[PDB]
Amino acid sequence: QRGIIRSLILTLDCSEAMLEKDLRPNRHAMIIQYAIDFVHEFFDQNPISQMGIIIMRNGLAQLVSQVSGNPQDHIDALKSIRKQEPKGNPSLQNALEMARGLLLPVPAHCTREVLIVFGSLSTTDPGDIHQTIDSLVSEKIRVKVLGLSAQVAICKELCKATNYGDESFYKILLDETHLKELFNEAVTPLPV
């Protein structure tokens, strides 16, 4: 919308839970498909904003697309990722620390947003995630989590702490239809 320059780190769970075939053909393939749609729409409606994409896989965070305002970079990252099998543990901490490395070099007057699609029941982290959360709050990184089905306490806390106590940024999707809607709502800039 040109008025606000956004930085959005799209963070995708590509861990073992994402193999599940309840969402079709499996959760991984479905999220990627909708993330692709999200990228096109995000850049069409935020023409001077930026995105970077991170995945959670094998206990690690991995950068799949660097921060840029070129939709094709992010589409290409998502397409090379959809051909590979989700695996191992998800680590919210590793992902959130990587996101800091992506966001911090960026000039201060851009928004700092992390959008996580989470399909797992727990996080497996190397250290103290609450320290990482402290860091996020102080550097004003706002975190939204789109969760599949099940309540995960740390997600609730994460989104609450980085959104001025507001608990509406941890959201549960049960099907494609609601996932599409949640992504579309992310296309619109954050309130306050």
From Swiss-Prot:
Domain of life according to the entry: Eukaryota
Subcellular localization: Nucleus
Signal peptide bounds: none
Domain VWFA: start-end pairs: 7-186
Family designation: Belongs to the GTF2H2 family.
Protein task: Component of the general transcription and DNA repair factor IIH (TFIIH) core complex, which is involved in general and transcription-coupled nucleotide excision repair (NER) of damaged DNA and, when complexed to TFIIK, in RNA transcription by RNA polymerase II. In NER, TFIIH acts by opening DNA around the lesion to allow the excision of the damaged oligonucleotide and its replacement by a new DNA fragment. In transcription, TFIIH has an essential role in transcription initiation.
Subunit: Component of the 7-subunit TFIIH core complex composed of XPB/SSL2, XPD/RAD3, SSL1, TFB1, TFB2, TFB4 and TFB5, which is active in NER. The core complex associates with the 3-subunit CTD-kinase module TFIIK composed of CCL1, KIN28 and TFB3 to form the 10-subunit holoenzyme (holo-TFIIH) active in transcription. An additionnal subunit, TFB6, plays a role in the dissociation of the SSL2 helicase from TFIIH after transcription initiation.
Other facts: Present with 2340 molecules/cell in log phase SD medium.
Protein name: General transcription and DNA repair factor IIH subunit SSL1
UniProt organism field: Saccharomyces cerevisiae (strain ATCC 204508 / S288c) (Baker's yeast)
Originating gene: SSL1
Shown residues in whole-protein numbering: 119 to 310 of 461
